[PDB]
Amino acid sequence: TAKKDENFSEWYTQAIVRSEMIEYYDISGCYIMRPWAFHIWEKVQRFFDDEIKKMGVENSYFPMFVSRHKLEKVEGFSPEVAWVTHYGDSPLPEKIAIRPTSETIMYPAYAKWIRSHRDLPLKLNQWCSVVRWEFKQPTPFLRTREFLWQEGHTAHATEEEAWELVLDILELYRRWYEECLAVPVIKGEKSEGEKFAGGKKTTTVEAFIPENGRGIQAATSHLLGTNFAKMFEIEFEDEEGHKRLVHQTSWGCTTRSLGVMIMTHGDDKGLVIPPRVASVQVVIIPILFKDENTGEILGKCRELKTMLEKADIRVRIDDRSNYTPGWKYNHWEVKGVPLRLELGPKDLAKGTARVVRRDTGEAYQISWADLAPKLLELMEGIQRSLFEKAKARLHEGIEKISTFDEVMPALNRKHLVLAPWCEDPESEEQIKKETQKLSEIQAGAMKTLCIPFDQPPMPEGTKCFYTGKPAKRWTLWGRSY
Amino acid sequence: MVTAKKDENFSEWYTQAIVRSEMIEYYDISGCYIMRPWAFHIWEKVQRFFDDEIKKMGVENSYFPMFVSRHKLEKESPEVAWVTHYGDSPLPEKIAIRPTSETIMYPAYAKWIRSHRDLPLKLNQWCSVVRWEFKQPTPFLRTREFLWQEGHTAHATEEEAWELVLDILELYRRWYEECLAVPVIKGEKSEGEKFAGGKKTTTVEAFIPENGRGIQAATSHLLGTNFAKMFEIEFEDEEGHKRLVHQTSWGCTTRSLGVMIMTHGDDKGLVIPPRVASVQVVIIPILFKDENTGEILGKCRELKTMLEKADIRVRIDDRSNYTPGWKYNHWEVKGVPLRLELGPKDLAKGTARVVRRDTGEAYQISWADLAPKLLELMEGIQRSLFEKAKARLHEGIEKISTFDEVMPALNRKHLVLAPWCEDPESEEQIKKETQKLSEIVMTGAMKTLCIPFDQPPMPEGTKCFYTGKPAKRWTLWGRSY
Ligand SMILES: Cc1cc(N2CC[C@@](C#N)(C3CC3)C2=O)cc(NC(=O)Cc2ccccc2)n1
Ligand code: PRO
Ligand SMILES: [Cl-]
Ligand SMILES: [Cl-]
Ligand SMILES: [Cl-]
Ligand SMILES: [Cl-]
């Protein structure tokens, strides 16, 4: 009912409801991931895990609790600590905390495990859930009490090796978004005001939501440097016998990616799932009505399913008798299955099937023998087309500007701005506050999204679009999630 | 290197084996442990096995919240861990961390299921849960937080549910026997030992000879219609009458790793069955006094490529900061099944020296014969580990007929197979009497482990070994985890 361009958050809520991706729950901010959503997580998890295993990153599991004494005697997703005080009706002798971060457990372990240069590099990953206690206005995948992620943490003898890993991981995050989810992203560096607190440098991939003009951070990969090694005394004796601090990285990516995929590819009809991650790629809809199944149509449906599955196509036959074919068409459209295969009496009488693409609605009459190759072709086409259209929208959403008087216009067009910036942090705070004020008066704030790796030329003497001081680099700004 | 002997101080041996093989890091909070990458590799092998198999059965993965409300939890709790505070302030309502997810998932099941067309519903989750007991913990075997999978299905009939119960139990037998080379006994739990709220619990039970204790390896419950009544999970059948669903739930945990360690470990540390070894063959180049250094490394990489063509999992330990003898000890204590040594002598002869971990036997193998001979050796090692463990299991069970045989058999560190009337009060009586007699860290009580599927014949008039009433079935008892 709600149109994506007119009432975006209503559209998002409804499209997620009707798609059966999630279910509600009696504790606020929590959402059940049903298979239609969880399978997408499984796909990107397998891709990213295969790739980091090639880099020698090994998975691990740390306890979810920290002792009161370890906390009393690192910035997390919650400012305060959640305490477990009882088991059943019995008070614990000492209350324990749900860990605010994994770093508080992992880094003391790293300080024990690393003693010598022979022990480096150390590369660990953990797939797990994460809890937040101070979410506001929850919404599936974007603002939740609990989400899923992977977090990698590595330690190296040199900063050069650590940085190399940071960038390799950022490239894997680009591939996670662009090759699996068909979502284009922009590689860049965070501002001093937006990077990880105690780290040296934060790199990020950023996406864009045209319907509200907002940038959204897709994933991050931090050069932590030696600051945490000094805090946690993670030292190694080098080849010459001198004690040195390790150079660390950490990197994470969450189920927020599913939300970004949803928002990127949905239309007024509902979700559109990229074929590479869809739980079902082709739904076979028999043109049947209740109490009339002779076996002719369902038998051919089953033969077609077998044939498609031998080409590794994920197929479901919706043979539920109590629904009309048109009901099923709309049901699977709203889920965003990328292809629908229609088989009725006429198709049986002709040796063909009618196949409809979800992204464009185009229909193809395809002989049974041709189904498996043609479908593979179509799915790649759909995947590619989903990405390129999104990429086009991304580039139409960014305006390259020179001066501050160009900001509020572009923000009113629901656009990001790429502007020469002196990178002075106080100026980012000033720009946020005054774009926020301006927005208020006009009826919010605009902040740095990233400093892109891809830098256009900077003419000699170009001045900062805000302070008028010498500009350092081109910086991508916008309203933000 | 391990120095405690498995048959002398079993607990010290076990701690040494799991720490020196880099599987476990002990932790500030008792009963919680850091699971290091070497352990996580084995977990990932059995996880992949079981996940692939349940996908063939149509079970889909999902993710439900880690928290559960007081009212859902108690519609149904001394192991449940309560979050009661955030910072210094009480939560308005305490919430529980999941010890299991029946009460989390089944309100959603009742919402989702309306028609016989909605069945069977088959969901699974891979996650961690928390059971905060104060009895003695053991890394892997009995912990306060652990990784597991939990599957939950709903069916139109009891018979279909029971088929799935038994199919999953067979997958747990394969998990232990086929992957981990650990023999298990299928049975049903006694009325007193079955899952609370369920109808019938089936189990696979393992045995640890060094301390004489049985342990439940995995469990598969027929929940029946009991939880369907609790949560109003109903469907309209084909005739239009409302019926309760018939449910199953099943789980298996990282306990499986503990049982593998204890089953196959020896005085030198771990022994990993080839089917779950992430490194099946470690290649050790013998570099001494610069003799053929480049040639040896090249031939090692060639041999790695050749072996990977046969799907053998190979690692070259060409780390320069360790001697060959160090690498021998390192990969032995970590339990790599096969070690391949290549030095100048081996290069000259066109062979390699291969040492199998379980027996220490050495082989001189031509390069051309390496892949078929190593495949044969690995299947021989796998089968031999299983057969030796199965022999120890058989020797650890005494078949008895009267209660005065119980304490001697328990004192030989054995289980007992006894005819039992299956009256539930007699199990409490037997636990208490055997505890008292044990006196004259873990409990000395003998409880039922399972009523085996495999039933010896019950001669007419056989008396229950404890009550003297007519025996019903043969029952396996022991001290237990
Ligand atoms: C590692 C692991 C496993 C399992 N259990 C249980 C039965 C089951 C089976 N089969 C579950 C259904 C799957 C299993 O594996 C249980 C546990 N801890 C606990 O009971 C809590 C605890 C902690 C310290 C001391 C005593 C007790 N710890
Ligand atoms: O804890 C148990 O025993 C059952 C089986 C997994 C889900 N709940
Ligand atoms: Cl997958
Ligand atoms: Cl740098
Ligand atoms: Cl954001
Ligand atoms: Cl695997």
Author numbering:
A (entry chain B): 335 to 407, 412 to 781, 793 to 830
B (entry chain A): 333 to 408, 416 to 779, 790 to 830
Quoted from the paper:
Among the aaRSs, prolyl-tRNA synthetase (PRS) is a validated drug target in Plasmodial spp and Toxoplasma gondii (Tg). In the current study, we examined five ATP-mimetics L95, L96, L97, L35, and L36, based on the 1-(pyridin-4-yl) pyrrolidin-2-one (PPL) scaffold.
The five PPL derivatives were buried in a ligand-induced fit model between the ATP pocket (470–483) and the loop (528–538). The phenyl ring of Phe485 and the guanidinium moiety of Arg594 support the adenine equivalent of the 6-methylpyridine core via a π-π stacking interaction. The oxopyrrolidine keto O atom interacts with the OG1 of side-chain Thr592 in L95, L96, and L97. We recently showed that HFG and L95 can indeed bind together to TgPRS, covering all three of the enzyme-substrate subsites. HFG and L95 compounds act as a triple-site inhibitor set forming an unusual ternary complex wherein HFG occupies the 3’-end of tRNA and the L-pro binding sites and L95 occupies the ATP pocket.
